[PDB]
């Protein structure tokens, strides 16, 4: 009987809630009460990269922390050189509605996906030099919202069909499919060791996935609206979720429970992108209302604002060595903050 | 040396900039149109109408009217939850909405279309995007209302007191009842659109049929009006 199963699910959820409550020995604010504040932080735009026609939906720093690839709704992948501002590549896409992009850890490939369910892999190191499509992954049945390379051969993608997918570029097939979410998945962040990866899926729930064995490990709740921004903590034992309820929240894998929320009364617009600094003390969070507040990830007190954008922020990412912060926006301008 | 590599990088940047300048003159000169509606709306017949004259997640149909190029985007594989992929179409020229009139009596297809149009109208990202509205279902409305099968008044109690407006003009030989129902259907969308639309975006109701040929001409005229109004607005003339 369906009614019997609902009662069992409710009982198990109550057991989970009771177990999490028992572990609530003390709050992060209480533990981190005596630490010194990070103080006010001023970040000036050290670089402004322009050349996109339509709104920018995604970007990704390179592993060298020098190059970055940007995707805009005008159908162009433009690879920038953040140091000299000079464009190195400009890839004309087959679909104008690209809403994600990625940079391979080796730097050989870049990928993009959009409203067309196909995910395209681009080879930057061709013999002739010109960028050509190496593989088109066409197994999804919905708009593709995020994609992250694991290596030069395996890419994990999250689509709007409520499923995350693990791919094999050489063969093009689906190695493993994750089917735990109920809403559209629109964010994911691989673990530092690439063993696991989380994903927020537009239903106020982030799930911890095992890439190898291939099923959800933990489910974290506490948001009141959609989730559209996620990022692992540099340590790898926490992550921060950006949501449409204008709050940022920090979760923990080991404690399996929320430990801190970053919200302010003056902000009533949802978060659109989150990132951490190298030390993990600051949690940057791109916002609607054209700001990107910088949050003290320990004391929850805001430290500074990266104001300077004239439209909605869409993407945000700190370099691997943590030297600079770049943002994107619907006005088609990227800005390097430091 | 470092200087040689730097100069090569500047040369590559100049080549890319020259190509992007050429590509800019096409993106700016082409109008992007989003075709919307439900399955019963007959939007597929409209797509065929554009195609004859000239499993993927999105379909692109390109047609030109008087040497002006238009780009029509039709969604084919996305799910029914539109609140997340509809934000991508906040910079299109004009959303084309096709209502499935007289496809009921979903319990109420027209009410669902009205709610969808209201949600589009009040969206804070689609608040500057105009919504052309083609009532593709009228010929069938006449047949379904003359025989009484459509039976509109039970669904909408406003049909018991609505009076045909002065500006209304029936087609030659059109029955008063079908004309009254047709103008009521439009007036509902007008009532939704005449609020929260002060000077940002506009709606262009149109009564049409699936077999109509001049749909491209009406889309062209409404896009022209949209462009002219935007240009007058940026000069603060209007």
């Amino acid at each position, epitope marked *: 009987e369906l009614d019997q199963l*609902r009662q069992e699910a409710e009982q198990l959820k109550n057991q989970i809630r009771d177990a999490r409550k028992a572990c609530a020995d003390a709050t992060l604010s209480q533990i981190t009460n005596n630490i010194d504040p990070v103080g006010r932080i001023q970040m000036r735009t050290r670089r402004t990269l322009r050349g996109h026609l339509a709104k920018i939906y995604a970007m990704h720093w390179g592993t060298d922390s020098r190059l970055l690839v940007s995707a805009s709704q005008d159908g162009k992948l433009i690879i920038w050189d953040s140091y000299t501002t000079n464009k190195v590549h400009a890839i004309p896409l087959r679909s104008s509605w690209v809403m994600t992009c990625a940079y391979a850890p080796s730097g050989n490939y870049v990928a993009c996906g959009g409203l067309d369910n196909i995910c395209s892999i681009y080879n930057l190191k061709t013999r002739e030099g010109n960028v050509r499509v190496s593989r088109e992954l066409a197994g999804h049945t919905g708009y593709l919202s995020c994609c992250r390379f694991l290596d030069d051969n395996q890419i994990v993608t999250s689509s709007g069909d409520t499923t995350c997918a693990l791919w094999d570029i050489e063969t093009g097939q689906q190695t493993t499919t994750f089917t735990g979410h109920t*809403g559209d998945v629109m964010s994911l962040s691989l673990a530092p060791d690439t063993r696991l990866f989380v994903s927020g899926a537009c239903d106020a*729930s982030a799930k911890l996935w095992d890439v190898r064995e291939g099923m959800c490990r933990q489910t974290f709740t506490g948001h009141e*609206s959609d989730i559209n921004a996620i990022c692992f903590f540099p340590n790898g034992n926490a992550f921060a979720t950006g949501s449409d*309820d204008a709050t940022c929240r920090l979760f923990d894998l080991r404690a399996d429970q929320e430990l801190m929320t970053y919200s302010h009364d003056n902000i009533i617009c949802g978060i659109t992108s989150v990132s951490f600094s190298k030390s993990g003390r600051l949690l940057l969070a791109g916002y609607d209302d054209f700001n990107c507040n910088v949050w003290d990830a320990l004391k929850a007190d805001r430290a500074g604002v990266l104001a300077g954008h004239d439209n909605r922020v869409s993407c945000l990412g700190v370099t691997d060595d943590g030297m600079a912060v770049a943002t994107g926006s619907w006005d088609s301008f990227l800005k390097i903050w430091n | 040396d470092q200087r040689n590599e730097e100069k090569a990088q500047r040369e590559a940047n100049k080549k890319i900039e020259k190509q992007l300048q050429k590509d800019k003159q096409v993106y700016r000169a082409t109008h992007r149109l989003l075709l919307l509606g439900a399955g019963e709306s007959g939007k597929n017949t409209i797509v065929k109408q554009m195609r004859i004259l000239h499993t993927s997640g999105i379909f692109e149909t390109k047609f030109q009217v008087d040497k002006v190029n238009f780009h029509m985007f039709d969604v084919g594989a996305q*799910r029914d939850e539109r609140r997340k992929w509809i934000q991508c179409f906040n910079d299109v020229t004009a959303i084309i909405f096709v209502v499935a009139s007289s496809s009921y009596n*979903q*319990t109420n297809r027209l009410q669902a279309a009205l709610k969808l149009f209201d949600s589009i109208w009040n*969206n804070k990202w689609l608040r500057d995007t105009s919504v052309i509205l083609f009532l593709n279902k009228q010929d069938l409305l006449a047949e379904k209302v003359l025989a009484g099968k459509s039976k509109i008044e039970d669904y909408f109690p406003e049909f018991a007191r609505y009076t045909t407006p002065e500006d209304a003009t029936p087609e030659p030989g059109e029955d008063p009842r079908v004309t009254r129902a047709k103008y009521f259907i439009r007036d509902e969308f007008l009532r939704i659109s005449t609020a929260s639309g002060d000077g940002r975006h506009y709606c262009y109701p149109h009564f049409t049929c699936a077999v109509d040929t001049e749909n491209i001409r009406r889309v062209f005229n409404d896009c022209r009006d949209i462009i002219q109004r935007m240009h007058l607005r940026q000069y603060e003339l209007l």
Partner: nanobody
Amino acid sequence: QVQLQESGGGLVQPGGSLRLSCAASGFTFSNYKMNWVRQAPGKGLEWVSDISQSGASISYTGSVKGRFTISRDNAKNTLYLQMNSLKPEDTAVYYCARCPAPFTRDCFDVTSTTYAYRGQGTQVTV
């Protein structure tokens, strides 16, 4: 977790009355717009009514205008629906839907098949 639980449904003769009450927890009730959604057997999901944040703006579907009445209690974090003069065609599963975003008056996706912030629903048969 966004939890919506409705109650008050049951069996009633035509021409009677029946009150549906929904209890909301896990989110600030006063910020979010609320709706009512019903699904007739053999049919799709049909929108019934809604109400703004403070209740100043109320709208109904055409077929139930004048017969139903929706009110919300932000202090008690609950939503009501007073149904009067019922009809046999009113037999449907009544779900309570919530606006996906807090402060937006657009209410996308509430009647979709797989909405994530919609209640389980209560059978109401006339």
